[PDB]
Write a protein that binds this ligand. Structure first.
Ligand code: HEM
Ligand code: HEM
Ligand SMILES: C=C(N[C@H](CSC[C@H](NC1CCCC1)C(=O)NCc1cccnc1)Cc1ccccc1)OC(C)(C)C
Ligand SMILES: C=C(N[C@H](CSC[C@H](NC1CCCC1)C(=O)NCc1cccnc1)Cc1ccccc1)OC(C)(C)C
Lengths: 457, 457
């Protein structure tokens, strides 16, 4: 099965029996993609175990794949390990079902519903600040993914179930506990590599009701949600919107829970990780930090509370965000399974092949980015923003299966930063990893957690 | 493979292909054993999946199995699911290795080392009491396995690593968290039944570094212990004793950790569960409660602090304990794998057969116990204690592979009760499950958690 790309005349690294090329993940996904990109060019193929994966780097062709042919051919992602009842979550479902879920859930993530979510996201901004100042006045360097996680948690809990925790001060609350155990899967830990040399074990683990979503976290939320559904009904958040939806093809009950669980993860270690990266940059780039706090004071004088509207009135802030997402696209890769034999942009691609877009690699490709390793937000200036190909820069994917939560994430994030730079400036500690090396793991997160210094303006 | 016992002319329930008799676990292990015991008599066999299990109820024969032939034939328990590096813990190791571990670890559990452990076990008695009185003065019915667990935790943490937590007030402490996730395996949950219809999947999960001991709890303790070992060395608890041992065949480092992890579980949900049962009895039997608080006041006047010595001076207290253990032997069953063809007490038993002693069933067998469903501690009076066959009553097993921690458990437990009945009396609430129905699950724990009323003497 390792002859495939040789036949198609597509170049790539020589696979080992059974292993395919996975030994080459010893420096993380990202480093492997850049290296293939340099060595082979615009297209290459390789083998996660026996599985052909075809990498592509042409924007037309990438558009063809994420847009033009999404429904017909490229509808789904690759399977990755036993998910149990979580089979039914939107990010994991296939074909007509996913097509369906997207619809049931899409209204929920509208700008308009989002704007109603703003003042709740506001209140925990106050918590974040107050918690920070306690560490600021005790001049002790601060690990971010803690205080940001604690914030990221409060937001989720509240924005999706109305649960109102100071999680940084109550990691004791059974709710907060469960919710944390939902962490970014280390796709390069002992498990998933084995899942990829031995995917024939996925059904094995399914019938064994083994689940990558801790059977306890899920058995908790499942019945947790079942209590909420029956206390609201009858006596603004995601659950409401989703409960409203199934009040008609309409969403189910177990289905509803598994969606919640997705939303819960997503907004947690992603929102948390990204902010960490941003403060790392804001910290190792004092001028950018300052220009930012200048925007926030001119659009919002006197430490004025942000509204929905004033947030989007802030362009530089957006630039910084975008630029950070370029440097750290926490997905690293987009993928779609080729469900039929197809020709796209004059290239034959056979069924079962997994088509991959190496986002990380593209973001640091010299050919589109001057000095791509540098952190330069002016890349995304209203002037320069026009020159950036949407199929090269894809922090949130693209097409019918892009990040459904994109607007909410950006709003969520921006809301925190604004309230954080209104009060504090962030400075590198002797202990701050400079330069920030990347987790050679299967996560896009830093090698070492970001520690900085926090001062009260 | 389902013909075995029919050939040997040994009676038992008819197995279904693949399933064996496991459909008959729908009412828990215990109920199935009593039923086989009544229906077939002194011996019977059945099939957990394709695995022959031979049950026996003859004391001679049970002695033969747990004692006389332990080394030669019956050295090990049955495998149960993927344990990863935990392969090396004493309760799980096989043959010469276990034989070895027992020796390295046996001194640790001496009465004499135990006596030095007493005053530490004392101090958290004070915590237990103070926490209780807070709920006592707020006349709100109390779930036991919480406050007892919280106690059971404090003891372990301290008695094995010197870690000194008020865990009831700090379930936030990363240590306490990890430690809790080590809970009594529900052998009748979705997993282990599948493990028993599909044991050929155990090696499957091994190579997948999948572990029944949460890979995170273990990766925590592993490095947690590695920090302690290197802070003590160089600058009274189980770790010390074990560290001392490997200071010579001597214990290893990973080995040392996996032992700790065992000790940690054992003293947790076992100590916790047992006390829960005892207060349930003490509660549904006011007179027994009173006689007890009378012993504790005569051997220890003026709420006198218990010493090692005064504890064993208390006989009734011991009786109550024993009697409770009769009613609720939390192991339910003892097992040993027959590693060779052998004849014992005039019975042929083939290799690979799993020999089982149905402790629960024996404890409620009428033929040894008058009114066995009743709770009557006078059964264990210094007068009557002589009539109890040690091979019928086996709460802690027997022979070279009995409960290594037996003395410590009994001491641990007794120390708590004494300090608890010195201050409080325990009364049934309208909500108290009366009579206490048993978890039809694979655990010996109650159907419903015990809730009682707590009053300040
Ligand atoms: C900065 C934060 C986030 C980033 C960078 C991000 C990025 C992504 C990416 C790269 C994808 C793959 C899309 C594709 O294949 O084209 C995706 C999918 C998805 N995202 Fe996010 N995301 C973020 C936050 C969130 C949040 C807060 C939610 C809340 C629900 C969310 C929900 C989803 C869902 C449900 C999918 C799968 C959508 C589908 O298959 O229909 N994401 N995201
Ligand atoms: C009331 C509490 C406890 C009860 C009822 C209990 C009961 C048992 C039983 C029934 C066995 C099986 C023995 C056999 O097959 O003959 C056992 C084994 C064992 N117990 Fe416990 N136990 C208790 C507490 C503890 C504690 C606190 C420890 C602390 C380390 C401990 C450590 C062990 C170990 C290490 C084994 C396996 C011994 C070996 O295979 O060599 N137990 N226990
Ligand atoms: C392969 C996935 N995830 C899906 C299929 S598994 C469910 C998924 N997370 C899981 C893992 C953590 C607990 C929930 C999701 O959907 N989480 C919401 C989310 C995450 C990140 C960004 N936005 C939303 C397909 C996919 C792959 C990459 C990026 C996005 C989706 O991702 C990881 C590499 C595992 C992090
Ligand atoms: C089958 C076992 N356990 C051993 C083999 S797995 C390791 C074992 N617990 C594990 C499970 C919870 C986290 C540690 C042990 O050794 N825990 C110490 C202990 C427990 C209870 C009483 N004393 C000591 C063999 C065995 C079976 C029954 C009773 C005792 C030992 O037990 C259970 C039915 C699973 C509860």
């Amino acid at each position: 099965s390792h002859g495939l790309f040789k036949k198609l005349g597509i170049p790539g690294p020589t696979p080992l029996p059974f292993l395919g090329n996975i030994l080459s993940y010893h420096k993380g996904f990202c480093m492997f993609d850049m290296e293939c990109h340099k060595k082979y060019g615009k297209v290459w193929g390789f083998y996660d175990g026996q599985q052909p994966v075809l990498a592509i780097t042409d924007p037309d062709m990438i558009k063809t794949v994420l847009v033009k042919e999404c429904y017909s051919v490229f509808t789904n992602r690759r399977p990755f390990g036993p998910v149990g009842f979580m089979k039914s979550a939107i990010s994991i479902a296939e074909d007509e079902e996913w097509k369906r879920l997207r619809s049931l859930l899409s209204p929920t993530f509208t700008s308009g519903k989002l704007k109603e979510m703003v003042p709740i996201i506001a209140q925990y901004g106050d918590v974040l600040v107050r918690n920070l100042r306690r560490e600021a006045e005790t001049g002790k360097p601060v690990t971010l993914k803690d205080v940001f996680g604690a914030y990221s948690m409060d937001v989720i809990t509240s924005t999706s179930f109305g649960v109102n925790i100071d999680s940084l001060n109550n990691p004791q609350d059974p709710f907060v506990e469960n919710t944390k155990k939902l962490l970014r899967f280390d796709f390069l830990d002992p498990f998933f590599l084995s899942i990829t040399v031995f995917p024939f074990l996925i059904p094995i683990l399914e019938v064994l009701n083994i689940c990558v979503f801790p059977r306890e976290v899920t058995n908790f939320l499942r019945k947790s949600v079942k209590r909420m559904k029956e206390s609201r009904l009858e006596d603004v958040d995601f659950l409401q919107l989703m409960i409203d939806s199934q009040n008609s093809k309409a969403l189910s009950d177990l289905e509803l829970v598994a969606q919640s669980i997705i939303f819960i993860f997503a907004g947690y270690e992603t929102t948390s990780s990204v902010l960490s990266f941003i403060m790392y940059e804001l910290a190792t780039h004092p001028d950018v930090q300052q220009k930012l706090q200048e925007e926030i004071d001119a659009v919002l004088p006197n430490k004025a509370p942000p509204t929905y509207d004033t947030v989007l009135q802030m362009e530089y802030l957006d630039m910084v965000v975008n630029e950070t997402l370029r440097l750290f696209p926490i997905a690293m890769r987009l993928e779609r399974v080729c469900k039929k034999d197809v020709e796209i942009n004059g290239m034959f691609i056979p069924k079962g092949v997994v088509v991959m877009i190496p986002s990380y690699a593209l973001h640091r490709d010299p050919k589109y980015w001057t000095e791509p390793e540098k952190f330069l937000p002016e890349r995304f200036s209203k002037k320069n923003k026009d020159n950036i190909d949407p199929y090269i820069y894809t922090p949130f994917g693209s097409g019918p299966r892009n990040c459904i939560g994109m607007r909410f994430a950006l709003m969520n994030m921006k809301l925190a930063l604004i309230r954080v730079l209104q009060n504090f400036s962030f400075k590198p500690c002797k202990e701050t990893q400079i330069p920030l090396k990347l987790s050679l793991g299967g996560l896009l997160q830093p090698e070492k957690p970001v520690v900085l210094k926090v001062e009260s303006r």
